[PDB]
Structure formats: C-alpha cells, structure tokens
Coordinates of C-alpha atoms and ligand atoms in Angstrom, one line a residue:
Chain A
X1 CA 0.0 0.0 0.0
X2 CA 1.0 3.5 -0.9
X3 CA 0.2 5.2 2.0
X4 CA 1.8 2.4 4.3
X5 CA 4.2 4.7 5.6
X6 CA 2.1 7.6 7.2
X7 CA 0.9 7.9 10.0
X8 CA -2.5 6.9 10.5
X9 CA -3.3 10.6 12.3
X10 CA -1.4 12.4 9.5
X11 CA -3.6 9.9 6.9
X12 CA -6.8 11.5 8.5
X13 CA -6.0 15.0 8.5
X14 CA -4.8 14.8 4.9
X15 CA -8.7 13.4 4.4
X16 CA -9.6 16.4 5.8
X17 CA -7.4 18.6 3.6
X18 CA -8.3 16.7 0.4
X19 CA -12.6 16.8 1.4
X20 CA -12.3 20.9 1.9
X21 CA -10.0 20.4 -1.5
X22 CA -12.7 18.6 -3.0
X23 CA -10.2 16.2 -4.4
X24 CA -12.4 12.8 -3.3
X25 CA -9.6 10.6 -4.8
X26 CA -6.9 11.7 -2.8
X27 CA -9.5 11.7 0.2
X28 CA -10.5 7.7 -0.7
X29 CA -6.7 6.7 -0.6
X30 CA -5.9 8.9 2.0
X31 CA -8.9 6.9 3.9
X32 CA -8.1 3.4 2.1
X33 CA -4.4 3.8 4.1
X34 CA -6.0 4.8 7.7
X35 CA -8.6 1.4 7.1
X36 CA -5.3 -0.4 6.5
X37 CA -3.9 0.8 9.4
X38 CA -6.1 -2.4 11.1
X39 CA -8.0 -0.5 14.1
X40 CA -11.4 0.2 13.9
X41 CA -12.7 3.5 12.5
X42 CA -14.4 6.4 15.0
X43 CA -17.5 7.7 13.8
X44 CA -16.5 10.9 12.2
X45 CA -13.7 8.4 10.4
X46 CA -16.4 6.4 8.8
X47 CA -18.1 9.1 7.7
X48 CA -14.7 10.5 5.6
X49 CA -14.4 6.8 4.3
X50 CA -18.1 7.0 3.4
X51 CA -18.1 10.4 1.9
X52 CA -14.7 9.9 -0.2
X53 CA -15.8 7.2 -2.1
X54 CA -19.2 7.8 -2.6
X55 CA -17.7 10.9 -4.5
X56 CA -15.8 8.6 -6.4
X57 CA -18.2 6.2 -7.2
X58 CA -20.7 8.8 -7.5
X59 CA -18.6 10.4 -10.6
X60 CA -17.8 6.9 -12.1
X61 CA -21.6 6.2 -12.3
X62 CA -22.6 9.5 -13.6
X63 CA -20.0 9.1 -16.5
X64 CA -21.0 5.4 -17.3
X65 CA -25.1 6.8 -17.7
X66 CA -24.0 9.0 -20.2
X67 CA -21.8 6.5 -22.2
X68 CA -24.8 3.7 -21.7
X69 CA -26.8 6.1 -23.1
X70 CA -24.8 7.3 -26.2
X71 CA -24.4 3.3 -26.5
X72 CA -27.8 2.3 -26.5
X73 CA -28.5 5.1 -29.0
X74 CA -26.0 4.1 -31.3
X75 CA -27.5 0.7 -31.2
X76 CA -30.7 1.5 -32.1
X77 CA -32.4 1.2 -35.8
X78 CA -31.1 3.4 -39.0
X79 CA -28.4 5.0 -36.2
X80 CA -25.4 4.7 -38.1
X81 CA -22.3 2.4 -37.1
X82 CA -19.9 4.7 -35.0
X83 CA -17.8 1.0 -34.6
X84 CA -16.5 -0.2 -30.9
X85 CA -14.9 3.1 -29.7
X86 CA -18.5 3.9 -27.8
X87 CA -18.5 0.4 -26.2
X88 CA -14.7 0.3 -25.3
X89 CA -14.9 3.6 -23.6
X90 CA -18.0 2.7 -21.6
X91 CA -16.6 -1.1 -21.1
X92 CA -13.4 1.2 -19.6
X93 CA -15.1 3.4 -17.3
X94 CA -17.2 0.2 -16.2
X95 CA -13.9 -1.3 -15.4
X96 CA -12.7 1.4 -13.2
X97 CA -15.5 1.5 -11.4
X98 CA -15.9 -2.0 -10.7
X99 CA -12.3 -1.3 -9.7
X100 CA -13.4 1.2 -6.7
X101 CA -16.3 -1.0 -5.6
X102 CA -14.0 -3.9 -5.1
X103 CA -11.6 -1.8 -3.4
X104 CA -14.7 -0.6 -0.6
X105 CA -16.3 -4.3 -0.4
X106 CA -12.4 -5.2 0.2
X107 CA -12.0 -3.2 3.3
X108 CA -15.4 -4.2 4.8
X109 CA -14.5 -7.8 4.1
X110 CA -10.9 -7.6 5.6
X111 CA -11.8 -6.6 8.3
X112 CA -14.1 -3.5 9.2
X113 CA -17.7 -5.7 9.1
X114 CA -15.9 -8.7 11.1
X115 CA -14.8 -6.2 14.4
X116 CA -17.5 -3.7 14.7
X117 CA -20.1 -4.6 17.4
X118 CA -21.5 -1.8 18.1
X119 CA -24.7 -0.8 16.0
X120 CA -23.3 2.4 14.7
X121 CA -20.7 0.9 13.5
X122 CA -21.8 -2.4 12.1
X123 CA -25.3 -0.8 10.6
X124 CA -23.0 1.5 8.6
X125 CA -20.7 -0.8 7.2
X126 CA -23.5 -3.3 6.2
X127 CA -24.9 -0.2 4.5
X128 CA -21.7 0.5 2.5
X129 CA -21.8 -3.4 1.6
X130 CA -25.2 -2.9 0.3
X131 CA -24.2 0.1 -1.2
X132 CA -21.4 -0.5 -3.0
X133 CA -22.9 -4.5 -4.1
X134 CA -25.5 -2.2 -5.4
X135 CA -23.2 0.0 -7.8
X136 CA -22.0 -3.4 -9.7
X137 CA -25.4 -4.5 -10.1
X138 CA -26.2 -1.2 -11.7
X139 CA -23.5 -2.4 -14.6
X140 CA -24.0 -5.7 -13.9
X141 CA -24.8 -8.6 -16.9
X142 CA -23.0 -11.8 -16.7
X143 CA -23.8 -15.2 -15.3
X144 CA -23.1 -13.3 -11.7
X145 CA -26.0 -10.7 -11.8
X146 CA -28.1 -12.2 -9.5
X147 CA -26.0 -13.1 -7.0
X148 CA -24.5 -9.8 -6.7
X149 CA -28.0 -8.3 -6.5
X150 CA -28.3 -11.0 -3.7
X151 CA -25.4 -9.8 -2.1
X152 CA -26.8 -6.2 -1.9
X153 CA -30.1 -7.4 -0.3
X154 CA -28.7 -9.6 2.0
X155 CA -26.2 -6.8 3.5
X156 CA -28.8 -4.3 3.6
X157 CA -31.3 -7.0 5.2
X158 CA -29.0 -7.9 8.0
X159 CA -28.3 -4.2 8.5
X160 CA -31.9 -3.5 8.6
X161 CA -32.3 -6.3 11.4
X162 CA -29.6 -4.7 13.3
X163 CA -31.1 -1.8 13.0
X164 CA -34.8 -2.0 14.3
X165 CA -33.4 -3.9 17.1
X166 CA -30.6 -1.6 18.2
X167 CA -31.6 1.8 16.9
X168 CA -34.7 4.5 17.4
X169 CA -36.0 5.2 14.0
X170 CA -35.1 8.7 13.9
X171 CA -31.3 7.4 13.8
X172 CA -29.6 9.0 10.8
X173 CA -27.7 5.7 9.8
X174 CA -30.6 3.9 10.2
X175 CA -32.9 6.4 7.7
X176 CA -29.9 6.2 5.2
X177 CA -30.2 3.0 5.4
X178 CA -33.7 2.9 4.9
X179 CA -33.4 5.4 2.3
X180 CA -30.8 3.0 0.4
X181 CA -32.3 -0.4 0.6
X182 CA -35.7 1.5 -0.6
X183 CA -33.9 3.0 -3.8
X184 CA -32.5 -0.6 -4.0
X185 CA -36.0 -2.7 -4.3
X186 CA -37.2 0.5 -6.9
X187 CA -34.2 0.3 -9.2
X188 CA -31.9 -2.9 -8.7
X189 CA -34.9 -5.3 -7.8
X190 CA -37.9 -4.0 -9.8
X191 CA -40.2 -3.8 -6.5
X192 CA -41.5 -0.5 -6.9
X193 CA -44.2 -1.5 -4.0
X194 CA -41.7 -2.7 -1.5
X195 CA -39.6 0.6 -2.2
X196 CA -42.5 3.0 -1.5
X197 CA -43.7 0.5 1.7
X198 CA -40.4 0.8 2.7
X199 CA -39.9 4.3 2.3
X200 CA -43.4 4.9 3.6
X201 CA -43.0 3.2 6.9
X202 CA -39.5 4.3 7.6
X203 CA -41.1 8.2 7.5
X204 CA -44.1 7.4 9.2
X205 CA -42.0 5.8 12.3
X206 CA -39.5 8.3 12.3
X207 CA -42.2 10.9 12.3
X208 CA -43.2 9.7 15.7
X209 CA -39.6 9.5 17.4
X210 CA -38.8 13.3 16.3
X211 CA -40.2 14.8 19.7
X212 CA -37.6 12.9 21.5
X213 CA -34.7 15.0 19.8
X214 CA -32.8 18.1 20.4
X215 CA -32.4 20.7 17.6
X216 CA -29.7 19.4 16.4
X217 CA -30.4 15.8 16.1
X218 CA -33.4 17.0 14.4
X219 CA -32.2 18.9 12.1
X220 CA -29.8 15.1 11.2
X221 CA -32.9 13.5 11.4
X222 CA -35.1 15.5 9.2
X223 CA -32.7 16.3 6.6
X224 CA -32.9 12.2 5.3
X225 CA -36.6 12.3 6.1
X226 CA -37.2 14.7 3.7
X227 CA -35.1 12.3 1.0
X228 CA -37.2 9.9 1.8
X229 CA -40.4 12.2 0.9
X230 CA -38.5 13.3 -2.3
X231 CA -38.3 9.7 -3.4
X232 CA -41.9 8.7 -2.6
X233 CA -43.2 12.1 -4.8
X234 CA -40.9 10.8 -7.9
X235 CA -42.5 7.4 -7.2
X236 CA -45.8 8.2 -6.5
Chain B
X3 CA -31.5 10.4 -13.1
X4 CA -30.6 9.3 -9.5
X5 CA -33.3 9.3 -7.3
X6 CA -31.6 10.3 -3.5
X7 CA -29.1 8.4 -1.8
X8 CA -26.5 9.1 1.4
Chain C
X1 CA 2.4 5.8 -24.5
X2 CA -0.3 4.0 -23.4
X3 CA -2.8 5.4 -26.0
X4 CA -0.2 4.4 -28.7
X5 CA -2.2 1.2 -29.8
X6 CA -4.9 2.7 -30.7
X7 CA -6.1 4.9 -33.9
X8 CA -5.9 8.3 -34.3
X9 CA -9.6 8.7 -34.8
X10 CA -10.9 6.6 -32.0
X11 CA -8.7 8.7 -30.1
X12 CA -10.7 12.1 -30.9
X13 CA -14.3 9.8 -30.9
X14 CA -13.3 8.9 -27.5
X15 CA -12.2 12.4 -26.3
X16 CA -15.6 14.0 -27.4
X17 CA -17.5 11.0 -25.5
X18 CA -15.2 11.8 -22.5
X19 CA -16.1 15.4 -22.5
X20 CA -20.0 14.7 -22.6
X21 CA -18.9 12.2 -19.7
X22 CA -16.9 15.6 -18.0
X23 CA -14.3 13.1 -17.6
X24 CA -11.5 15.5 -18.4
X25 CA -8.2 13.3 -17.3
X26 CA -9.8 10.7 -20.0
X27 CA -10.0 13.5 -22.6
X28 CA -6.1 14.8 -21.9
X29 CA -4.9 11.5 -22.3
X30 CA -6.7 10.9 -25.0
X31 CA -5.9 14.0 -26.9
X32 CA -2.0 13.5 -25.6
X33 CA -2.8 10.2 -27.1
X34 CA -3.5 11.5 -30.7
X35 CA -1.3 14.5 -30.6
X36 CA 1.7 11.7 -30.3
X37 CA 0.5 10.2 -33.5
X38 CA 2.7 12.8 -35.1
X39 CA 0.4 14.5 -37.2
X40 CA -0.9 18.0 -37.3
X41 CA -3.8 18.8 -35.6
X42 CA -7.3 20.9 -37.1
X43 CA -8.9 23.5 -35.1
X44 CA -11.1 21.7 -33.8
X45 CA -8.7 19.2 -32.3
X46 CA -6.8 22.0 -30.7
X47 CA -9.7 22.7 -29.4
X48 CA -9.9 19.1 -27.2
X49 CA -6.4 19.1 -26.3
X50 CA -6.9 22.7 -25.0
X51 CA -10.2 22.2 -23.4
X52 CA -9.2 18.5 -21.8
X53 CA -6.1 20.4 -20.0
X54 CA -7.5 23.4 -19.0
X55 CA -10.3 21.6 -16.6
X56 CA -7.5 18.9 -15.2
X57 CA -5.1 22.0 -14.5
X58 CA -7.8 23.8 -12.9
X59 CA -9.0 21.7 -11.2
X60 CA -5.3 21.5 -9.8
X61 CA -5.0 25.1 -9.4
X62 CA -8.1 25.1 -7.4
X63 CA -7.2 22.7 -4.9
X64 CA -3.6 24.5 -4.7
X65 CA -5.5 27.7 -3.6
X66 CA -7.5 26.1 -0.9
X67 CA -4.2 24.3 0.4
X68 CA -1.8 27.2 -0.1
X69 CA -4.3 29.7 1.6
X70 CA -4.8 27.0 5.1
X71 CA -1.2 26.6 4.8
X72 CA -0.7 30.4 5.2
X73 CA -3.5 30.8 7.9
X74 CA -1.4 27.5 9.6
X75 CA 2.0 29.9 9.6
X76 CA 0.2 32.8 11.1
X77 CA 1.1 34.0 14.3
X78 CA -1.3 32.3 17.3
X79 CA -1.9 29.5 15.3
X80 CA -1.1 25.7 16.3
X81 CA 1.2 23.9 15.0
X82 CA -0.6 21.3 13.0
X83 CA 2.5 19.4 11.9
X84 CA 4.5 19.1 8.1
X85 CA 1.4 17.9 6.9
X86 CA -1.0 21.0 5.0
X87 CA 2.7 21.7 3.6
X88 CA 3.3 18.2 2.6
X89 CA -0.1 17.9 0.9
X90 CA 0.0 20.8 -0.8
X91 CA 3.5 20.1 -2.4
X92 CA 2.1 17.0 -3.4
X93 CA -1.0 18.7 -5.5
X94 CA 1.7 20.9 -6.8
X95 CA 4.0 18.0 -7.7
X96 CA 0.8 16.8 -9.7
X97 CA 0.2 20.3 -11.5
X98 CA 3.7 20.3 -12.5
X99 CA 4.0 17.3 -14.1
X100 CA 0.3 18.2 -15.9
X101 CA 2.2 21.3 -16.8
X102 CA 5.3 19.9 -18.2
X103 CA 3.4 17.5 -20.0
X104 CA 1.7 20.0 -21.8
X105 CA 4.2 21.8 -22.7
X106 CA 6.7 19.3 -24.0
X107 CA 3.7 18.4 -26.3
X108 CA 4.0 21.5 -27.6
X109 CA 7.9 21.6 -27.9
X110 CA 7.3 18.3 -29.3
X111 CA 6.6 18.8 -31.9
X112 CA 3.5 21.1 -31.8
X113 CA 4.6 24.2 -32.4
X114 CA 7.7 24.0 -35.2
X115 CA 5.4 22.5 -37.6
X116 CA 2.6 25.2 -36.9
X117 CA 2.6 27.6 -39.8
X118 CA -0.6 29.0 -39.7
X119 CA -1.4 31.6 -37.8
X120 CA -4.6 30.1 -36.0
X121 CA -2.0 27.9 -35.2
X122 CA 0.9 28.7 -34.4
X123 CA -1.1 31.5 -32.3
X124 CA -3.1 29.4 -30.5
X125 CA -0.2 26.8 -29.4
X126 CA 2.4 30.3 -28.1
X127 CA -0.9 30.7 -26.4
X128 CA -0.9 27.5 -25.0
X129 CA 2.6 27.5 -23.9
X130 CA 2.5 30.6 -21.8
X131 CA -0.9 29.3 -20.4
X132 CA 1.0 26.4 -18.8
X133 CA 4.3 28.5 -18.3
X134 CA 1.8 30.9 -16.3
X135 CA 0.8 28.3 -14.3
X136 CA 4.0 27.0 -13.0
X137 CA 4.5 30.5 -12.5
X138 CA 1.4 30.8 -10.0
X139 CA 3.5 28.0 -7.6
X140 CA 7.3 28.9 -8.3
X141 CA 10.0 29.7 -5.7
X142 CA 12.9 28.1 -6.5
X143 CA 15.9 30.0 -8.4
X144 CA 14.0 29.5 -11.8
X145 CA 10.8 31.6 -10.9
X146 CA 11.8 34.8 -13.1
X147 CA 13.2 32.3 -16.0
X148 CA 9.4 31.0 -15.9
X149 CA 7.6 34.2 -15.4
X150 CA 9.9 35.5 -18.7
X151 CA 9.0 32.1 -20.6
X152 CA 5.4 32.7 -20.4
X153 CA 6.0 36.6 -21.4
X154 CA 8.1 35.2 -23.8
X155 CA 5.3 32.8 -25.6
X156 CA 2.3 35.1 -25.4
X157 CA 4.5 38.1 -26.8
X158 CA 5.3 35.7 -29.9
X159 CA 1.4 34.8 -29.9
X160 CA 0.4 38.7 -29.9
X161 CA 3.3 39.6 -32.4
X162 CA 1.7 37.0 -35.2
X163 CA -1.7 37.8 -33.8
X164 CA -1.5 41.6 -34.7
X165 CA 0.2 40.8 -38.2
X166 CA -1.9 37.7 -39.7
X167 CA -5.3 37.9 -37.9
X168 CA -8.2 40.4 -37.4
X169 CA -8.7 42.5 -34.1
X170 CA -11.8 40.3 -33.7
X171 CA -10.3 36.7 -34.0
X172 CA -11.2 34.7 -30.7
X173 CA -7.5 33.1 -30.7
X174 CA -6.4 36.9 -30.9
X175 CA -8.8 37.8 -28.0
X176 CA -8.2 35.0 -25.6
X177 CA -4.6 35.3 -26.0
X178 CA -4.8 39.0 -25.1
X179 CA -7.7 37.9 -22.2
X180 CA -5.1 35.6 -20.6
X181 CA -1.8 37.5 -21.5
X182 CA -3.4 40.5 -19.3
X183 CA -4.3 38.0 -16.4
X184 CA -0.6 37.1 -17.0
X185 CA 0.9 41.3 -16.2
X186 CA -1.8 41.6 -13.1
X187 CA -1.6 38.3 -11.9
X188 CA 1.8 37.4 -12.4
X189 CA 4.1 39.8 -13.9
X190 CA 2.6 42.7 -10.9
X191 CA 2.1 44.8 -13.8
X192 CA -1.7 45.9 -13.5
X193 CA -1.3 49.2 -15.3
X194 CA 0.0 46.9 -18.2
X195 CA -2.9 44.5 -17.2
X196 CA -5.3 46.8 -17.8
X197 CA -4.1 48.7 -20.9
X198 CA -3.9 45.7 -23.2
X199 CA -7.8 44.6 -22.0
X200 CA -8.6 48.1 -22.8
X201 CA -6.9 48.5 -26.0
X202 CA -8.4 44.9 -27.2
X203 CA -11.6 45.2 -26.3
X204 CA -11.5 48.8 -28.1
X205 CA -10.1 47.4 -31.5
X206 CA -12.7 44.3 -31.2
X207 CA -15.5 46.3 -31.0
X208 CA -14.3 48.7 -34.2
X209 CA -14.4 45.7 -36.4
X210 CA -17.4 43.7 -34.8
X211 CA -19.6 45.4 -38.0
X212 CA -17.5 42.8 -40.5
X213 CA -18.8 40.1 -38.6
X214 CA -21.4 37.5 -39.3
X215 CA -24.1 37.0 -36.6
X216 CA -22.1 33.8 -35.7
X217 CA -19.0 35.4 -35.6
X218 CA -20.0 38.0 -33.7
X219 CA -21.3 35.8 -31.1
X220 CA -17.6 34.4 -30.5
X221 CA -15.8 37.7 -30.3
X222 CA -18.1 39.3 -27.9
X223 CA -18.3 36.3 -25.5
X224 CA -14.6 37.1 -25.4
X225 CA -14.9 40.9 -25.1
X226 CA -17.2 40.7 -22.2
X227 CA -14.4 38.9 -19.7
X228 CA -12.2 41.4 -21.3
X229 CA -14.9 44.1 -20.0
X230 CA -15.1 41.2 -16.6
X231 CA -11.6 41.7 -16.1
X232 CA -11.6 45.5 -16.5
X233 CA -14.5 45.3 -14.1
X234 CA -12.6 43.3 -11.4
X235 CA -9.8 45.9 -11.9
X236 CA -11.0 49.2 -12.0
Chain D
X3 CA -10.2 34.1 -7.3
X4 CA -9.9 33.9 -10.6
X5 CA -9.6 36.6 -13.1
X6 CA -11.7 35.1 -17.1
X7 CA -9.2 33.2 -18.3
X8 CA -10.3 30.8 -21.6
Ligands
LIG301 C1 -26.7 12.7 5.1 C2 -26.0 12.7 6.5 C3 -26.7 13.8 7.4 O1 -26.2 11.5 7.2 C4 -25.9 10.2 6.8 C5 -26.6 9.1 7.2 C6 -26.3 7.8 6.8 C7 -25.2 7.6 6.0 F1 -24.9 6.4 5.6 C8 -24.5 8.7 5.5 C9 -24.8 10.0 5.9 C10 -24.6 13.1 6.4 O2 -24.2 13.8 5.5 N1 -23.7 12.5 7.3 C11 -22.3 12.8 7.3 C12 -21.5 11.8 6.5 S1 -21.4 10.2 7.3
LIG302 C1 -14.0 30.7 -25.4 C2 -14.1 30.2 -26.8 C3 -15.3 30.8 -27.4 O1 -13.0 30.6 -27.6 C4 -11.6 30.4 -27.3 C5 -10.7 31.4 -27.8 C6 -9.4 31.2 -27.6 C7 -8.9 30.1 -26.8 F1 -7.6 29.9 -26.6 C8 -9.8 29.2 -26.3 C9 -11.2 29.3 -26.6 C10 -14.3 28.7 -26.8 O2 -14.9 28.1 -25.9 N1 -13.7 28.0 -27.9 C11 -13.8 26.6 -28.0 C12 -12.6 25.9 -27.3 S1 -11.1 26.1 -28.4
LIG303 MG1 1.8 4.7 13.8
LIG304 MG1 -17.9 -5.2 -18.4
LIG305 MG1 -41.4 -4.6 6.3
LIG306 MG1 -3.3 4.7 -37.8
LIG307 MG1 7.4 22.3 -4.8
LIG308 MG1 0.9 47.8 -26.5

C-alpha cells in the first residue's frame, strides 16, 4: 500500500485537507491507508471513508449513464455504425468502477464488518456493503448478476435487522439506510411497492420518534426524512 | 437520473 | 504511451465522449494520445487538447489555492502547529500540476509548435505554452521563478506579435490570447497598469471591427470581449 | 479568485 508509511493521524487529517479540496480521490486513498492501518474506525472516520468514495463512485456512475446512453443510441435502428470506440470507452469506465467498488467491499471484508459490534458501527458498514454490491449490479450482466443483486439485499437485510433492534427510527444511519435499501428494491430489484412501503414506513416511524430530539439531532434526522419524501413524490 | 441516496 | 495502440480517430471519438462524460483526465490523455500520433492537428482538435487540460489543471490550481491559503492561515502568528502535513499535501498537488504542466508543454515543444505555420496555429499553441508557463509560475519559488515568469512573457509576446500581423482585431484566438496575457501582467508579472491597458486597447479594437462580422461570428468575439470588459471590471 | 481566463 502506498500510503503504508504515514501515519495513521497524519492519513486522517490529509482526508480532511483533500474533502475541503474537494479532491475525493486523494481523500479515498488517503482513507483506504488509515482502514489499512487495522484499528477500527471512529464515527467521524467512517463518515470521511463514506463520503470519499461515494464521490468517487458517485462520478464513475454519472460518467458510465452517459456512455450507456450514447451506447444504446447508437444501437438503435437506421443509427449509423460509429464502430466499438463507444463500447470500449463505456466497457473502460465500467472497469474502473468496478475497480473502486471492489476496493470498498475489500476493506469491509478484511476486516471493518468482522470487528465492529457496536450498532453504529456495524449498521454503517452493512450499509456500504449494500451500497457498493448495489453499484456493480447497476453495470451488472453476466452469469453473476443475480448473486451480486443477492449480495446487496442480503447486507442491507441484515443491517436493517440490526437496526430495528438496536436503533430508534429517527437514527440517521438507520434512515440512510432505509433510504438506500428503498432506492435498491425500486431500481436494482424492480419492487417499486416494496420501495414505496419501505420508504413509507421508515417516514411514518420516524415521524413519531422526532419529539424525542434536540435541535440538532433533528435537524440530522429530518434532513434524510425529507429524502425519503422526495423519493416517494418521484414514485408516487 | 438518481433518485436520493447518502 | 499507453494510447499508442490505438487509432488516431478513436482517439478524438473517444475524447468527445469523455467530455459529454466531464471526464477530463480521459480526454487529456486521449488527446496526448492522438497528438503523439505525429500528425498535425485541425482547429477543432486544438480545441480538445486545450479544453481536456485546461479543466485537469484547474481543477489542480483550485485545490492548490485552498491548500496554499490553510497553509498560510497555519504559519500565522497564534496558530497551532498542525505538523508538516498542509505543507506536505499541498506540495504534493503541486508536484501533480507540475507534471500536468510539463506535460503539456513538452507536447507542444514536441513537436506542436515547429510545424505550426498557420497563424490560427501557431497563435493558439504560443498561447498554449505561456498558459501552462503561467501556471508553474502561479506556484514557483525556486531559483528559476523569473526564468518562468519570462517564458510565459516570452510565448504570449510571440502569440500577440503574429496575432496583430496575420489575424483580425476580432479573431477569438487573438482575443483570448490577449484575455489571458493580461491575467498574466496583473496576476503574475505585478504589472496591472499593463494589465489593464492591453484589455482596454483589445476590447476597443474588437469592437471597431465587430460590424465585418457574421451573426455567428460576432457571437464568439463578444463572448470574449465581455471577460475582457469582466476583467476590467474586477480591476477598475 | 480567478480573473476570465479561456
Ligand atoms: C446525510 C447525513 C446527514 O447522514 C448520513 C446518514 C447515513 C449515511 F450512511 C450517510 C450519511 C450526512 O451527511 N452525514 C455525514 C456523512 S457520514
Ligand atoms: C471561449 C471560446 C469561445 O474561444 C476560445 C478562444 C481562444 C482560446 F484559446 C480558447 C477558446 C471557446 O470556448 N472556444 C472553444 C474551445 S477552443
Ligand atoms: Mg503509527
Ligand atoms: Mg464489463
Ligand atoms: Mg417490512
Ligand atoms: Mg493509424
Ligand atoms: Mg514544490
Ligand atoms: Mg501595446
């Protein structure tokens, strides 16, 4: 590993450098070398891990919807043959992105998922698991698709168990979460119903939790409930 | 389009 | 070269797709890609290598900024020591500019600009050259900072030279090489008198000679004049 | 800040 020979506080703070930089791939190595470190991440840690490559990612699957697009245009009838340079490019930036989301579902595998006991912690992870198993399904056609879909349910489902059992519904990993796994079933699963019941219920309880919070934690709180009532009006 | 995500 | 495998024409197809994609590192190496296929390049073309470059550097120079100006506040008096590591980061973004930088320019030293007979250009890659001479310029300390400063006053004074001989007041090479060469004397060269004059004195001759113009035309050259008339703004 | 550049 590059970053094997800085310190793990040094690591951090350059995350914090690179975020206010808004240069998210120096900010995912930067965090890739404190997870390799071996200890187990703090809260506002996970949260730089979290928001580094989902800025990443995020980019990488905003490029491949355009290229997809151009693709299936120039596939359709009486376009004319452009020849593989539209495929290669989008087979490339597919690649890369696969890359990343191996690189994530790495780290959670060896070892964040196996030493975090607490619900903050493991709920979070599970979620990037979902998350990221999630991305390669969106690019996802070989013999492998359905298990990786699978593989996203599954880690969001054993989240989600952890979850009702260990956190109030107003907790914002636990709406995220929510949020996620809802977008999941609509897009990834083709369960519109189960994303909108899911989506549904997740506001409803949350809703009734909110008069147990301070200012602050509402404002946290309210923030991904109003995500959740953005998704339900596209749906609905 | 993406619907919303954290 | 890791583009050298592949044609010359995929290489511009797939630096247009990577533009719709905004994935501007793509584009640069793609157009470094076709520009070390040894053969001239159109207008257009210029127009991808310049375009691809300009977002990666600034992108560079942005971060720079916000690193350079928390490694200032970090130096102030009352402030805590924080460690080598702002400095550290922000010499590594430099590193990265000034290898972008050097890239550029030794594309067009080889062999970009000695087989550029043209005005549009031969103009446009001087341009070029103090552009990315400018820009090591913006982060130089060492004992070659004048020797830079004088290599990018050195380029665009070539650029304007042609520029005033072989192409109307209202050509948009002509009028971003004299948008940036008067950045270059306020930003670089502490010279805003000089700064100022040359915006003034372009914008003036433009707008004597916008009446040849086609409606077409005229839209390029007075996008151009009105961040001359930005700049003059900013300035006076 | 940045002065127009193009
Ligand atoms: C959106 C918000 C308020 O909350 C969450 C909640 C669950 C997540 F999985 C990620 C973020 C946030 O920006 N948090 C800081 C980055 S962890
Ligand atoms: C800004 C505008 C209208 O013109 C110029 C003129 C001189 C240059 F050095 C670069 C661009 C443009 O976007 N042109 C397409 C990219 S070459
Ligand atoms: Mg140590
Ligand atoms: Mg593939
Ligand atoms: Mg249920
Ligand atoms: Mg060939
Ligand atoms: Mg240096
Ligand atoms: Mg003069």
């Amino acid at each position: 590993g590059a970053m094997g020979s800085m310190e793990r506080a040094s690591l951090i703070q350059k995350a914090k450098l690179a975020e206010q930089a808004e240069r998210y791939e120096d900010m995912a190595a930067f965090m890739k070398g404190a997870v390799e470190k071996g200890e187990e991440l703090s809260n506002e840690e996970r949260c730089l891990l979290s928001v580094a490559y989902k800025n990443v990612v995020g980019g990488q699957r905003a490029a491949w919807r355009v290229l997809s697009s151009i693709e299936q245009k120039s596939n359709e009838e009486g376009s004319e043959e452009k020849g593989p340079e539209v495929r290669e490019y989008r087979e490339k930036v597919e690649t890369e992105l696969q890359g990343v989301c191996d690189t994530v579902l790495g780290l959670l595998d060896s070892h964040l998922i196996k030493e975090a006991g607490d619900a903050e912690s493991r709920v979070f992870y599970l979620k990037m698991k979902g998350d990221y198993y999630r991305y390669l399904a969106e690019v996802a056609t070989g013999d492998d698709k359905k298990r990786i879909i699978d593989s996203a349910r599954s880690a969001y489902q054993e989240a989600m168990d952890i979850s009702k059992k260990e956190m109030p519904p107003t907790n914002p990993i636990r709406l995220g979460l929510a949020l996620n796994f809802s977008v999941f079933h609509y897009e990834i699963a083709n369960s519109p119903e189960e994303a909108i019941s899911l989506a549904k219920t997740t506001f409803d309880e949350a809703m009734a939790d909110l008069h147990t919070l301070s200012e602050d934690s509402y404002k946290d709180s309210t923030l991904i409930m109003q995500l959740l009532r953005d998704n339900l009006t596209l749906w609905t | 389009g993406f619907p919303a995500t954290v």
